[PDB]
Ligand binder design. Structure first.
Ligand SMILES: *[C@@H]1O[C@H](CO)[C@@H](O[C@@H]2O[C@H](CO)[C@@H](O[C@@H]3O[C@H](CO[C@H]4O[C@H](CO)[C@@H](O)[C@H](O)[C@@H]4O)[C@@H](O)[C@H](O[C@H]4O[C@H](CO)[C@@H](O)[C@H](O)[C@@H]4O)[C@@H]3O)[C@H](O)[C@H]2NC(C)=O)[C@H](O)[C@H]1NC(C)=O
Ligand SMILES: *[C@@H]1O[C@H](CO)[C@@H](O[C@@H]2O[C@H](CO)[C@@H](O)[C@H](O)[C@H]2NC(C)=O)[C@H](O)[C@H]1NC(C)=O
Ligand SMILES: *[C@@H]1O[C@H](CO)[C@@H](O[C@@H]2O[C@H](CO)[C@@H](O)[C@H](O)[C@H]2NC(C)=O)[C@H](O)[C@H]1NC(C)=O
Ligand SMILES: *[C@@H]1O[C@H](CO)[C@@H](O)[C@H](O)[C@H]1NC(C)=O
Lengths: 372, 101, 51
């Protein structure tokens, strides 16, 4: 009648409540319900459960609990261990499974009811590979942190088979934040061009230890992979003369979009985020930005189909959801220029391989856009 | 009611049944290599297939007894690049020139 | 000469970095020597080329 119900599975915080991706999902449902102009007949409710992100069975419990309670979509357990579990819950039951962060798609996965609003690393990799040729390099050094990130950079590893690069691949130590044994080698090894593959939490920690090593002269050039380089405290580095270069998807250029981020920080007012870390405060990460888009993309789909009755499904009984294929194809065919530019999926797999990045770089006047 | 589960033998479903066996306590004896995620906090699993952290140095020893200076690693699926970590990272410490296809 | 009023000697050190001067014989008190040595780090003028 006037109610639809989205699911939700998030990490269980203990110290400091309501973590980062949970706020993005709550702020999105409240926004669409408030601004009545979009979707003007039904009100969205939510059933966010909280698990550990490294338990593929605690995820499978809370997935069937939301299926028994009755939902219309599950917005991702957001980690490669339990994402593959809840995806195959949603395939047998028929319910869509909107992911929000990249995982390893196995090449023979025969599932269909999933979309991935995080940009594919089959397209980010060629965006980096284009950017190591506009700068005309012949010797790079890919540094990653966990072993899954080597699958993230396939097209950059396979690149010296067709171009003139000379790859040298290193790995950060897994346990500590002390990568000074690594950087002493790279300073001595004459490697001035680095393509770091880290999260922005670990990218700030290397960028402080690359300053204490004196490896931040005007001879170096760091390309970061993460789409959160705009949220770095780059003020200790802006005068030195380095050229950090990264991509950026979250459109700050639009006034209608940057109004949301200004309205984001007022609920983020209760956050002293320990400013001795290296992260700017009051900025919304790109992982929370995609969850705010993922609610609106499905909200476009329910607008184009008012015949949804949220039924309750059993797991132990095997029966697909009767509005499955009708509602899933509307999600794969959608457009919504929300926070992160154009959201349009790919009809073959269901991923996102068509997006609009902004190449950002470091200058003395801050961290500025130099291309698209 | 069993005492052990002898592996679903593939990287998609091995990670599922491993985390079934961790919460239930039952051992999970694997029999073929998968991608161990570096932050997996499970304990009830053994892997009788030899690790590719040790096969990789066995290959890297064998490309030096033959005294090579130019190799060409060819793999088939993308998981196999994680299989050969220590051979890709090798020209940072030796005199090889890797070309990966 | 350092500016007399401020502790901001970044207009000075931008010239010395650009002027290729790698050898400096600073005459300061240790209160002001610590303040220049922090601003010589934010300018990136503390590589292994300087003395
Ligand atoms: C849905 O998703 C699928 C993925 O499965 C998309 O398919 C991919 O589409 C991209 C489009 O960019 C294809 O990219 C193309 O591949 C080239 C690779 O070079 C090969 O071929 C040349 C010449 O034959 C050889 O020399 C070489 O050795 C390789 O064998 C790339 O060079 C091109 O992409 C990029 O080119 C340059 C990079 O330097 C830049 O201009 C751009 O970054 C450009 O993107 C070329 O476009 C890719 O092969 C497809 N298949 C995959 C990944 O398996 C679908 O397109 C998508 N559907 C949509 C969007 O509707
Ligand atoms: C509430 O929704 C309405 C209807 O969309 C918004 O009005 C326009 O929204 C579109 C995109 O949704 C913008 O491109 C237009 O610029 C908006 N028109 C204006 C600003 O006159 C409205 O902006 C939404 N409310 C808020 C607070 O953003
Ligand atoms: C790498 O470093 C500099 C330092 O940020 C980049 O910026 C230029 O800095 C010089 C200082 O001598 C200014 O005169 C230029 O105007 C700056 N560039 C622009 C576009 O404003 C510089 O762009 C980078 N150079 C290379 C070759 O990568
Ligand atoms: C649904 O919303 C539209 C808005 O244009 C309205 O015209 C229509 O009457 C609504 N349907 C109802 C209230 O059943």
């Amino acid at each position: 009648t006037h109610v639809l119900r989205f699911g939700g599975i998030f990490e269980y915080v203990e110290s400091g409540p309501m973590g980062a991706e949970e706020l993005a999902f709550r702020f999105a449902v409240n926004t669409i319900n408030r601004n009545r102009t979009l979707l003007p007949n039904t009100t969205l409710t939510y059933d966010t459960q909280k698990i550990n992100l490294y338990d593929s069975f605690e995820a499978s419990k809370k997935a069937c609990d939301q299926l028994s309670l009755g939902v219309a979509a599950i917005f991702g357990p957001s980690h490669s261990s339990s994402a593959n579990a809840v995806q195959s819950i949603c395939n047998a039951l028929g319910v869509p499974h909107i992911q929000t962060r990249w995982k390893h798609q196995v090449s023979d996965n025969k599932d269909s009811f999933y979309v991935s609003l995080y940009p594919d690393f089959s397209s980010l990799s060629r965006a980096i590979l284009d950017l190591v040729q506009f700068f005309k390099w012949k010797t790079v050094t890919v540094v990653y942190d966990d072993s899954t990130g080597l699958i993230r950079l396939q097209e950059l590893i396979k690149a010296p088979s067709r171009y003139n690069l000379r790859l040298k691949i290193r790995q950060l130590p897994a346990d500590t934040k002390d990568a000074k044994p690594l950087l002493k080698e790279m300073k001595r090894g004459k490697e001035f061009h680095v393509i770091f593959d880290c999260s922005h939490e670990m990218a700030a920690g290397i960028l402080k230890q690359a300053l204490a090593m004196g490896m931040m002269t005007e001879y170096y050039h760091y390309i970061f992979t993460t789409l959160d380089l705009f949220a770095l405290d780059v003020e200790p580095y802006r005068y030195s003369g380095v050229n950090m270069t990264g991509f950026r998807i979250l459109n700050t250029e639009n006034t209608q979009v940057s109004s949301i981020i200004e309205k984001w920080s007022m609920e983020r007012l209760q956050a002293p985020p320990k400013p001795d870390s290296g992260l700017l405060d009051g900025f919304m990460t790109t992982d929370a930005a995609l969850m705010y888009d993922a609610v609106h993309v499905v909200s476009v789909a329910v607008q184009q189909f008012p015949q949804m009755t949220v039924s309750s499904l059993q797991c132990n009984r095997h029966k697909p959801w009767r509005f499955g294929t009708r509602f899933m194809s509307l999600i794969k065919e959608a457009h919504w220029e929300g926070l992160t530019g154009r959201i349009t999926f790919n009809k073959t797999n269901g991923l996102r391989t068509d997006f609009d990045l902004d190449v950002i770089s470091l200058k003395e006047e801050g961290l500025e856009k130099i291309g698209t």
